[PDB]
């Protein structure tokens, strides 16, 4: 398509977003996955299995719901919620996993590994591996196993082995490091089911392609319900999978604003945040050239966020390309702002969101005040908040 990278995975030509910043030891399996995806993405047998699982198993299409009780809290704008929280396993991650798990089987791989931070990608990977009869190992930071314990037990119930990563900041970037070390050693029989729109080529493109169904549905649904294209489409941005998935169908609609909201932790001025675009700079990290939080020597600055899914110091390269082109704007949302939107969504619409998604809801409220009455703002509600109930109840003193 018009927005795809070259055969080397580079977005935007000379700027060099993406690519493959991996060791040569991984190139045989990386090229192996790239070829298998190019072969199967045009195979009707493959596409039939994917659509069929998304329909009868994952529960697609997810609905688009106008949260009318939020309007007065958003400058009387019209907030539409793309209800990815209603998917099987409870987030958008199942979209990307069903595609990659089917691909892992087409390649003959007998083992699937994955990282997880909020646990949603781990639960999704474990879910598809149980369905397809694949061995599954999930790497999860020790801090993430504590604050997302519900998903740890869900993964173990689904037959997946969970390895707690205790190195580094014990969060998402540390689980990715360990899963990389695993893939290097077991590349000939193990498929790496990467969970976000980052990594080396072909993963930023392939993950986005499996998440494009979100925006394609949203673009049809918003025209049917509102009579026109939205004034803005917003989503939270950790690595960038749920945002790029809903953004993509609107890239060529020049009137549609696109805003991604990243985690700002205790505040961007505090050094305890994950605001990659707000405070980071270009660099090579986790297989791609993109933005990341780094110090003056290029060492990765550890991120912090109340949300485990956005607690990541990097970002996918296609987002760095869209920021450079000025097509998408990226704004910070703090822990406090996200938790306010959390409770507000509970009391107004009876929807308990993932703390990740609460960032997008918080930014939508601020964008609604800017755009004014009658403005249509589509929000990607990436997941539900079952995993975050303990954290949120403690935040509001309900114990």
């Amino acid at each position: 398509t018009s927005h795809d990278p070259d055969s080397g995975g580079h977005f935007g030509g000379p700027s060099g977003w993406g690519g493959r910043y991996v060791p040569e030891a991984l190139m045989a399996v990386i090229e192996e996955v790239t070829a298998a995806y190019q072969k199967e993405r045009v195979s009707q047998d493959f596409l039939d299995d994917l659509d069929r699982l998304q329909a009868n198993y994952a529960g697609r299409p997810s609905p688009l719901y106008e949260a009318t009780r939020l309007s007065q809290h958003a400058g009387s704008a019209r907030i539409f919620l793309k209800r990815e929280d209603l998917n099987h396993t409870g987030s958008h991650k199942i979209n990307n996993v069903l595609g990659q798990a089917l691909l892992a089987r087409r390649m003959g791989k007998t083992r699937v590994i994955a990282e997880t931070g909020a646990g949603q990608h781990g639960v999704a990977t474990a879910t598809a591996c149980a369905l397809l009869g694949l061995d599954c190992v999930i790497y999860m930071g020790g801090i993430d196993t504590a604050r997302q314990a519900l998903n740890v037990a869900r993964m173990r119930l689904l037959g997946a082995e969970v390895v707690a990563v205790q190195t580094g900041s014990k969060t998402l970037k540390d689980a990715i490091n360990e899963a990389f070390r695993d893939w290097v050693a077991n590349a000939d029989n193990t498929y790496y089911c990467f969970g976000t729109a980052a990594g080396p080529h072909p993963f930023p493109t392939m993950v986005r392609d499996f998440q494009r169904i979100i925006g394609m549905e949203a673009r049809v649904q918003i025209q049917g319900q509102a009579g026109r294209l939205p004034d803005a489409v917003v989503a939270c941005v950790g690595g960038g999978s749920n945002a790029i998935g809903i953004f993509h169908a609107f890239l060529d609609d020049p009137g549609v604003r696109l805003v991604g909201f990243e985690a700002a932790g205790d505040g961007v001025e505090t050094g305890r945040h994950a605001a990659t675009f707000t405070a980071g700079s270009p660099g090579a990290f986790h297989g791609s050239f993109s933005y990341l939080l780094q110090d003056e020597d290029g060492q990765t600055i550890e991120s912090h966020s109340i949300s485990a899914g956005l607690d990541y110091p990097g970002v996918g390269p296609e987002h760095a390309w869209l920021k450079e082109a000025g097509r998408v704007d990226y704004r910070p949302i703090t822990d406090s702002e996200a938790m306010d939107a959390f409770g507000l969504l509970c009391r107004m619409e009876g929807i308990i969101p993932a703390i990740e998604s609460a960032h997008a809801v918080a930014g939508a409220l601020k964008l609604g005040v800017e755009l004014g009455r009658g403005a249509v703002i589509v929000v990607n509600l990436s997941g539900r908040g079952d995993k975050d109930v303990e954290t949120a109840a403690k935040w509001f003193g309900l114990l």
Binding site: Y21, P23, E24, A25, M27, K173, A187, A284
Partner: protein, 248 residues
């Protein structure tokens, strides 16, 4: 005309032996102690010194080196400390290259880092996470500042990629990893005469002897870090033992 490390492997080929390549990370246990240990390597018979740049997320480094670079970064090591360590090695009559991950180079600037590395006496750059497919800026910087570019090959390397990786390397080729090490060297020697270094978690004098039978160079790192952790004299003794295994 020729590679910078070429004359070193020629001198080892005439003396009927392999070159001893030693790795040590800058700033472990601190910057002065690491520079003193790197000078000890040159005195104890190391033909080439791999000066390691500690990185916050070293995906390719083992547990001995990763924990050493973690301690160095906790101690506040900087990238400029590596260039200062290269100069101290070149002043002490040694021959040093820098092994780093690529993001510290991008942050520094590829051309600026090559220029300052060459000015410090450095002879080349080992890039474990930089494949030739992304080395446009580095290929140009390697030419202008006359630096060797040591890429890595692997057992799983396809024939097409192994040929492209070897064609892109100057100085020597890092064969990283049963019978895989000599088989990987044989595949490199079947397409080029460029020297081949082999890293295999070398611990003993006997292991360096087995590798010197087919490899042009023997790469030791984790064992040197473990030796330096016990004491500076232990590093000298081990480096001396390794200096004898390569002559067999």
């Amino acid at each position: 005309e020729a590679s910078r490390l070429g004359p070193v492997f020629d001198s080892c080929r005439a003396n009927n032996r392999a070159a001893l390549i030693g790795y040590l990370p800058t700033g472990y246990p601190d910057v002065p102690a690491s520079v003193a240990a790197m000078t000890a390597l040159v005195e104890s018979g190391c033909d080439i010194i791999e000066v390691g740049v500690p990185y916050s997320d070293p995906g390719m480094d083992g547990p001995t080196i990763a924990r050493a670079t973690e301690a160095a970064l906790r101690g506040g090591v900087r990238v400029r400390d590596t260039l200062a360590a290269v100069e101290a090695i070149s002043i002490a009559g040694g021959r040093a290259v820098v092994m780093t991950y690529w993001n510290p180079v991008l942050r520094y600037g590829v051309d600026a880092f090559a220029r300052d590395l060459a000015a410090a006496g450095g002879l080349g750059l080992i890039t474990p996470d930089l494949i030739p497919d992304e080395a446009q800026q580095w290929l140009a910087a390697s030419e202008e500042h006359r630096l060797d570019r040591i890429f890595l090959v692997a057992p799983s390397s396809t024939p097409e990629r192994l040929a492209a990786t070897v064609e892109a390397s100057r100085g020597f080729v890092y064969a990283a990893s049963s019978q895989a090490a000599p088989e990987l060297v044989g595949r490199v020697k079947a397409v080029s005469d460029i020297p081949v270094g082999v890293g295999l978690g070398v611990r003993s004098r006997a292991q360096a002897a087995q590798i010197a039978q087919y490899a042009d160079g023997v790469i030791v790192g984790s064992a040197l870090v473990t030796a330096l952790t016990e004491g500076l004299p232990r590093l000298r003794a081990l480096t001396g033992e390794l200096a004898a295994g390569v002559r067999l």
